[PDB]
From a paper:
Chemoeffectors are sensed by chemoreceptors that in turn stimulate chemosensory pathways that modulate the activity of the flagellar motor. The dCache domain is the predominant extracellular LBD in bacterial signal transduction systems, and it is present in about 15% of all chemoreceptors. To identify the molecular determinants for acetylcholine recognition, we report high-resolution structures of [name]-LBD (with bound acetylcholine and choline) and PacA-LBD (with bound betaine).
We demonstrate that this chemoattraction is mediated by the [name] ([name]) chemoreceptor. Acetylcholine and choline bound with high affinity, with dissociation constants of 23 and 2.6 μM, respectively. The structures showed the typical dCache fold, and alignments with all structures present in the protein data bank showed that it is most similar to the LBD of the TlpQ chemoreceptor from [name] in complex with histamine, another neurotransmitter. Well-defined electron density was observed for choline and acetylcholine, which permitted the precise placement of ligand structures. However, the tails of the two ligands point in opposing directions. The choline tail interacts with Ser217 and Asp235, whereas the acetylcholine tail interacts with Ala168, Asp171, and Ser172.
Residue numbers in the entry:
A (entry chain A): 25 to 328
B (entry chain B): 17 to 332
Amino acid sequence: GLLEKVINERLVALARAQVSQIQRELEYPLTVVHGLANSTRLLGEPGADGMPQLNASRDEISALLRSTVQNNPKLLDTFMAWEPNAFDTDAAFAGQPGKGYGPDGRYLPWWYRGADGKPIVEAMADSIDSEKLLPTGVRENEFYACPKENKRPCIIDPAPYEMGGKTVMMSSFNVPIMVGDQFRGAVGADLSLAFIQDLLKRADQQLYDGAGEMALIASNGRLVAYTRDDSKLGEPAGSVLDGNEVDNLKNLTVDQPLYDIDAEHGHIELFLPFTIADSGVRWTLMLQIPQAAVFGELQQLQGE
Amino acid sequence: ELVQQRTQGLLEKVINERLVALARAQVSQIQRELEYPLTVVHGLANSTRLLGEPGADGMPQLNASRDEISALLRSTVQNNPKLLDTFMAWEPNAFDTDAAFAGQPGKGYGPDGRYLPWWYRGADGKPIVEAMADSIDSEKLLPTGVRENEFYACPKENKRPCIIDPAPYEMGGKTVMMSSFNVPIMVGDQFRGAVGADLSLAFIQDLLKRADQQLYDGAGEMALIASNGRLVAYTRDDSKLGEPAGSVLDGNEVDNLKNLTVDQPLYDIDAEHGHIELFLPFTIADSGVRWTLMLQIPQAAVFGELQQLQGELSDQ
Ligand SMILES: C[N+](C)(C)CCO
Ligand SMILES: C[N+](C)(C)CCO
Ligand SMILES: C[N+](C)(C)CCO
């Protein structure tokens, strides 16, 4: 009993250390966009003279967004959308091109890197009002609708979006721009699934020299990362995982691991539900690892 | 009796490996907590550097006043309650003419007009500002061995993020031990200033104390040792915060932490004071910092586990 416990407790600690590393990685975009939101809300917060604390034009705000992309290579992008006439009169900017404005002048910049890496901007006019469901079960405008409805930060499950002519699966990290209790807009950043897959492959290598495999499962059950096969990213976990596993995914409470042994295959399954800063999201790190890679010392002792 | 030697060594190994795993988990949580202030102030730097970066037309990408930059700093304090403060210093005449501001009080300016705001919370929790005029140019060694202006001198010298070992500063009439998280404000390859935020040692101590209560049910202790060997945290004794780890450790321990590779664990077993010590050095992002987590476990607690392990094995 006690020996198996001490071995199991090592396994869980090492897995917990990797959850913490993934959390650090996934909390970073939210902290970045929190900063932009805490600066941009000052456009609508009066100071001692009764005028906004920050008197930045739209071009200066976009400069902040562009600087974010330039100086955070791990972020796929940075984007901001204001409510209609949130901080100025949309109609005065309608028809101005190349600045991220909707046709009616709404402020909707999406900044990302062109082919040569230099930041470019697109208006989000097409997606910001779209409530259509993307192929991964995510509402097209969820990155904006979620902060608007909840007035809190939102991390969005994997969804495909077209970026410079290619389809990129990504997850968004979003914070509302609040002036008092008024939702004025939202600012966010995406991480690509390719980036997060690379993170999870690194994490899995730290567990018994990569003897096992890991999966990162979003709140809707779809795969953010899956070290076994890059082709499964964005798929329902139920379409990759064996019945034993997709069952245990429903047996989970945040921060409490679930530990199981698949008898037919002789491996350990470890499920570590976790959350990310103030986003309220519940993702799950799953570890699948052969018993032999973990319990060799027990085996050695029983050999004596 | 060889078998007994082989069996005991193997039982000890499983215990030793578990504690190493717990130390790695604790280091990973510490890294998560300590990366956060650097990301915040990187955002401040990435906005403020726009005051000197040219746009398409030549004029600067951000035309914001000192008041507006201070509003960004105040907003950071207000909205980041884990942070003790937020502060920024510009080179002389970095983004404007200091002399136009010389003499103006209550805005965080030096006597000569240099921009040097230090924003923190008053007793009512609302942010207030102090100029860093007395510290920004002082290389005096503070009681913890840190230069008074290291928070600025290190980003200036190295042009990269800097995390500073514990140092005391007067805030609101009281001496507070803190560690700063600093980044340079670069326009191109030119240092124009730096921006930073402090965490109090009280905050880090509290973190480590809460974690120690989950290690052998609080029976042991933890410490965090800064790059110069002084205590960032020490769960046993609040009064050692800032003190040399060598002052509270009876072995050769702190000396050959210098010789230990980042992310390599090292046990030091002292049967004489009944202590098992585990050191795990680590770094934080690209700061270059070298801090060490220490776990201290009563030997008798591990001795007791070995007995139960040995017995359970003998029973079956
Ligand atoms: C990709 N958008 C920027 C359009 C939304 C966030 O994923
Ligand atoms: C919306 N207002 C700017 C009027 C309130 C600020 O708190
Ligand atoms: C306390 N200061 C802000 C003066 C320096 C950073 O520790």
